[PDB]
Amino acid sequence: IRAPSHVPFLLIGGGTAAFAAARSIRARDPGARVLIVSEDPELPYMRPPLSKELWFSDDPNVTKTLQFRQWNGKERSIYFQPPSFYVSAQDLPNIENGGVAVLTGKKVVHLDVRGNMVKLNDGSQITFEKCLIATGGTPRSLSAIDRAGAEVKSRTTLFRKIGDFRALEKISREVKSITVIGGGFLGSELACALGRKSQASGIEVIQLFPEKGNMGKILPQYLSNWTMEKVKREGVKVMPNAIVQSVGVSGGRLLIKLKDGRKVETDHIVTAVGLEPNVELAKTGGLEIDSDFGGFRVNAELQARSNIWVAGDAACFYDIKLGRRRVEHHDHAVVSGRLAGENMTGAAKPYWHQSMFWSDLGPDVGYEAIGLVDSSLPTVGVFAKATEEDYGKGVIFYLRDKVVVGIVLWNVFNRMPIARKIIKDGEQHEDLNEVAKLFNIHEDLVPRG
Amino acid sequence: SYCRQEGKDRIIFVTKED
Ligand SMILES: Cc1cc2nc3c(=O)[nH]c(=O)nc-3n(C[C@H](O)[C@H](O)[C@H](O)COP(=O)(O)OP(=O)(O)OC[C@H]3O[C@@H](n4cnc5c(N)ncnc54)[C@H](O)[C@@H]3O)c2cc1C
């Protein structure tokens, strides 16, 4: 198939961000002609299931069907839409009322900003009227793994793509011990996914990380510790305060020697130690990178230059209330993609509507969260007490200048609107205990996810 | 109203009664 020489809407990076954009473009301006160029050969799909929902599928054909049952009991696929609902790259600049074409297995390798053109890996060039960068990002590798030999390197996976899941699902039924390095969102979610699978398979599940407790970059120590202990229950050997020093191959099995001196024998390793943005095209185009936050530097309306927007994880925008930041969540990729698409069609409206995130670590831990959630800030957790400490349920406020900037709804569900208001308001509330009463914590509420 | 301050993080427990 041949690429169209020109297209009005070019979305570099066929992920969760690109899809929202194209959907929002098609919506705001009907009969749009949108081309998503995606280095990935898979059509746009959502990632959350790959750490959570697809590991709990009873159907053993899950690795092939890539379906799951939503917390509402309805069954769906991780793909945003089926192939039939995309037009072809060939037929895009003709088909009546345009549509969305996805160019699978094609990387943009140069962004000619001045001339409104991209050059593809295969030479073929495509000009655009409006362009969005939605390159997302690639998972960070652990230094120690890089330094080690290719024997150990070959037995180390990272997690992002579909194949990552499909291969680690196999490896879960093969080895006797899997060690996850890193205490991240993903770290924990995989450790708990494998932990639940181990209830039947009996496999050793180890998770080690340098923090004192799980999710130590977004949870305050007490909760962080408590969450670690709840992960433990799901079937995980958790080793906090683990700084890896070197990983060799001892006895046909990977040996992880920590700086504190502890050794760990295991068969396979999965590093979930953070995400690096795919800011490749920055140099080619002369677009700015946030020195502090990483990713492309875009203004309040996710705009970089006259005809270039950025969204998703790759985008470091200016949140008019919370300040400049880059956020790497799923609802963020969607919200920002939506907005970019609006602005591309000419709305020029700023990021006002907040994006959020959620994680579920077993049945005991499930939290929606909004805005500036960063364990380094001062927190005020308000939890429910009974009628030997139970942080089972409550709400945690994140402060900056005596102003709430982030909230974590701890096992409190369907309350995100209320929280959202509190962020908008950014009042200097004398007592946050009152503000907490707004979330009817003690009340059973709804048990989504 | 068990309120206790642990560094930067402040922890308030409450029992529903209002
Ligand atoms: C397993 C997993 C579970 C998650 N669960 C949650 C969750 O529960 N909640 C939550 O809020 N977030 C979650 N996230 C985070 C969220 O899914 C991601 O932030 C989101 O998918 C990023 O979307 P994006 O389009 O910006 O980037 P991506 O989804 O990474 O899409 C980027 C795409 O662009 C392609 N690309 C990159 N560079 C180029 C180039 N130069 N040319 C062409 N194509 C290019 C990439 O290969 C890829 O296809 C999860 C992530 C993972 C990995």
Ligand SMILES: NC(=O)c1ccc[n+]([C@@H]2O[C@H](COP(=O)([O-])OP(=O)(O)OC[C@H]3O[C@@H](n4cnc5c(N)ncnc54)[C@H](O)[C@@H]3O)[C@@H](O)[C@H]2O)c1
């Ligand atoms: N619930 C959700 O919203 C969710 C779920 C899954 C994934 N994600 C996203 O997926 C991506 C992957 O997240 P992630 O878990 O890889 O990173 P993360 O950013 O979620 O967590 C970073 C972690 O890196 C670890 N780390 C850093 N350097 C290390 C080192 N030298 N040795 C050991 N550990 C080290 C730390 O323990 C820290 O907890 C991110 O974009 C994240 O937001 C989000």
